[PDB]
Amino acid sequence: ERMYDVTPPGVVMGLAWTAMGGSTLFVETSLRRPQDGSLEVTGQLGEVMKESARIAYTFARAFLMQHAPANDYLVTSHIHLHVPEGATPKDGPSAGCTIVTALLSLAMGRPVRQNLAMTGEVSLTGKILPVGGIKEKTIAAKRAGVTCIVLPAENKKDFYDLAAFITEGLEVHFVEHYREIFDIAFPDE
């Protein structure tokens, strides 16, 4: 199956691939000090992925300054973000939306929708950009029991290049901006 059967606040399921195939990953976040905040990052992340964490971090604060200006959690807290397993090298920008979601989930004290997974690059203003490995990611999500998958709008052709027996029985959302992801990940906000 997968590392988390049920995700608590601050944990979001993302997807990855290599030449060997696709996999699921979980972005984890946590306070490292009790309540000018900071973000510490671990998980053998490559340079491009570390930058995406910085972009996601800035965007998550801006997004929270709007959706809930009274919530200074991300602006003041000292947070640690991790992507297990600890020894596996990871890179690329396709977990940006995953990281935004983990940070907002932690700052609101609200888990995301269960059996949900996502992949997509996020820009500084929250645009969702296309990524690679749609086939492998989709197959790995299915195998892990994911019932709701979130993909960049520009990966739509990639998704429907797949045979119907792969994609049927999958609730899929194609998104252009992170706000759409927020409404799917957090339906009761």
Tell me the CATH number at 26.
3.30.230.10
Resolution in A: 2.2
Q: Which amino acid is at 173?
A: H
Q: Is residue 151 part of a domain?
A: yes
Specify the residue for token string 């690679």: 132
Q: Is residue 37 part of a domain?
A: yes
Catalytic entry in 23, 52, 94, 105: 94
- Chain centroid, CA 43 distance in Å: 15
For 59, what's the count of Cα atoms within 13 Å in the CB-facing half-sphere? 25
Helix (H, G, I), strand (E, B) or coil at 120: coil
Q: Is residue 1 part of a domain?
A: no
User: What are the distances in angstroms from CA 158 to CA 16, 108, 129, 131?
Assistant: 15, 33, 13, 10
Q: Is residue 154 part of a domain?
A: yes
> Count of domains in the chain?
1
Q: Is residue 3 part of a domain?
A: no
Q: Is residue 171 part of a domain?
A: yes
The Cα–Cα gap between 153 and 129 comes to 8
135 labelled catalytic = no
Residues 6+ apart with CB under 8 A from 65: 75
94 labelled catalytic = yes
The Cα–Cα gap between 69 and 7 comes to 26
Helix (H, G, I), strand (E, B) or coil at 95: coil
Query: Structural domain of residue 96, as residue ranges?
Result: 11-185
The Cα–Cα gap between 114 and 111 comes to 8
From the list 150, 129, 138, 152, the residue with the least C-alpha distance to 52 is: 129
Catalytic entry in 137, 142, 156, 157: 137
User: What are the distances in angstroms from CA 186 to CA 39, 105, 119?
Assistant: 23, 8, 16
Q: Is residue 6 part of a domain?
A: no
- H helices then E strands: how many in the chain? 7, 9
Residue 139, both tokens: 């197959």
The Cα–Cα gap between 59 and 44 comes to 22
CB 29 within 8 A of CB 11: yes
Q: Is residue 27 part of a domain?
A: yes
- Give φ, ψ of 101 to 5 degrees: -65, -45
